[model samples]
Target: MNIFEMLRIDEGLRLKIYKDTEGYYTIGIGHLLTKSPSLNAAKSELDKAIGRNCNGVITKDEAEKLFNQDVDAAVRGILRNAKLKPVYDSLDAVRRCALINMVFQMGETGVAGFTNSLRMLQQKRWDEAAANLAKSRWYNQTPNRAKRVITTFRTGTWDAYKNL
Candidate 1:
């Protein structure tokens, strides 16, 4: 079977949104609602990117391609807008990847708005930076994912926080 088929089998293709084991809303072979753009947001960026409309359903093939592109765009956006090149470059891989994931979840503009968190990151105040991120609306929206990301910020590791 092809990679798409493999993923479809592994992730179990579902046409409708359903909560996964972690209680995150997911659909279309495990696509997370939180990670992808809303229908209106997609419409607004329709001209800039290519993909399905809000009400449109996508094939497994199309989803795989879009997923890859979204990851690329997220990394590119972080490199483009985070601006503190030296600071970003100085971060460990896990920390840098966490920032990229944040850019992915909350567009470059949203990530850029975390001035205090960014400053803390630049200053290498890892714990404070994680706490700063936890104070945001994004953190409130998806506390579990936020906690995971914050753990990376605090410890520069891909592990979950001890208290969590």
Candidate 2:
């Protein structure tokens, strides 16, 4: 599935939900970086070069051309962390988006490095996934975001800010 599909974005623009990286979530459309490249800047110049990979502003092809390497690095992160293809291999588009989004928010070594959580997800174990979600530096840093995304993927809906 395409990246957008993986993020559960059936309609509406990829909204800037959080304010971590210059008030832009990396999972969001590429245009955000244009406004605040310093905070939203990719981990390196290569990533900054890609900009946001949105449709109207920047074609997907352009995003691929400019930042494929950085995106690849992000994708490979999942495989590297879990050491099992099935974790990322079996992910739905939205789940993949959520995972990538989380990794982007938390940094590759920070979030994408979840071996046990990825394993639990590969097995479709919701409680375990939730528990695993609570066991990271991310949990320490952004408990609400972690719980929100985990619940969104688990229940197949988005009720993040409601304190559920």
Candidate 3:
């Protein structure tokens, strides 16, 4: 699958306001609503981003726009991240997308926390790299998604959504 499809598949879709695993108020393809300090703040920012006075909902089309922006945000953050930049260039496109997916979920700094995994990836040991990621709390939190990301890192290909 393509990067966009992979992300879309992974983040899934939600039209109504809801809390993510970390308890952040989120809407529309994992688009975090305004830092999520207050529900009121989240509603206002959701209004601003959705371009409508959504009580607690977003349009499917609007979600696409949010996804576009979020992907750019992830890419920009990944580029500026000091730890990731040094080794990012050494990775192939598939590996880079895998890293991007990780950053997309938990932010750049969260991925940076996986120093050993990053080192393994930089050294081109795909198995060790993915193995370290499996040991992370992130894996325990979202084993399904983490499985796909780690598999992509190791296989250097998008994983088939197979269950047969």
Candidate 4:
């Protein structure tokens, strides 16, 4: 079978909007209906047109297209954040990748909220940046992953397994 067929079987196409395993609104082969501003706007616009009736659905190919577009928009958001671009560009490649991962998980807006941390990074203060990052709600919520990210920012090495 082709890759698309395999993905279809794995994702299991649905003809109506339904909550996924995580209870987020999703439809049509795992196309998530959250986070993307354009998707939310489109849903709102469609609702306005149809008087809140959301019986619309998408095909497998359409879902694939939407997924691709979602990923592209997310990447664009990382690159488009004015506050993050210069600081991100000045980092080492590994640190850049770490920042990318953080931005991917939190989006540009979420990363931008780390104002002091970003300031330390821009000032080339690695230790302070790491400390500021560790003092965040993001770190509090996910210590393990934050440790990996903070360690990379602090020491330029991946030491996630080390004693913290």
Whole-model Cα lDDT of every candidate shown, in order: 0.63, 0.54, 0.86, 0.65
- Report model 1's TM-score to 2 decimal places: 0.66
Give model 3's clash tally: 0
Candidate 4 wrong stretches, greater than 4 Å? 1-72, 161-164
lDDT of 1 by residue, 1-164 (tens): 22233234334666545556546555555555543345444333432333445353455665565556666776777667646454568788767767766765566887888889888898999888888888888888778777777887898764463332
| Winner of 1 and 3 under lDDT | 3
**Candidate 1, clashing residue pairs?**
none
lDDT, candidate 3, 1-164, per-residue tens: 56788887888899998888888899989898866579898899899887789998888999999999988988888889899986678899888888888899989989899999999999999888888889988999999889988998999876544331
Q: Model 2, range 1-164, lDDT digits (tens) per residue?
A: 44443333322233332233345434333323433445434333324454544322344465444344544666777667655346667877656666776654455666646778877888888688878888777667656556667775576444553332
User: Any residue pairs clashing in model 4, and if so which?
Assistant: none
Quote the lDDT for 134 in model 1.
Answer: 88
What is the C-alpha local distance difference test score of candidate 3? 0.86
Please name the candidate that would achieve the greatest lDDT relative to the true structure. Answer: 3
- In model 4, what is the error at residue 59, expressed in angstroms? 15
Off by over 4 Å in 3: 34-38, 160-164
Lowest lDDT sum, 10 consecutive residues, model 2, at 9-18
Error at 55, model 4, angstroms: 15
Task: Identify the candidate with maximal TM-score.
Answer: 3
- What TM value does model 2 have? 0.51
Ranking by lDDT: 3, 4, 1, 2
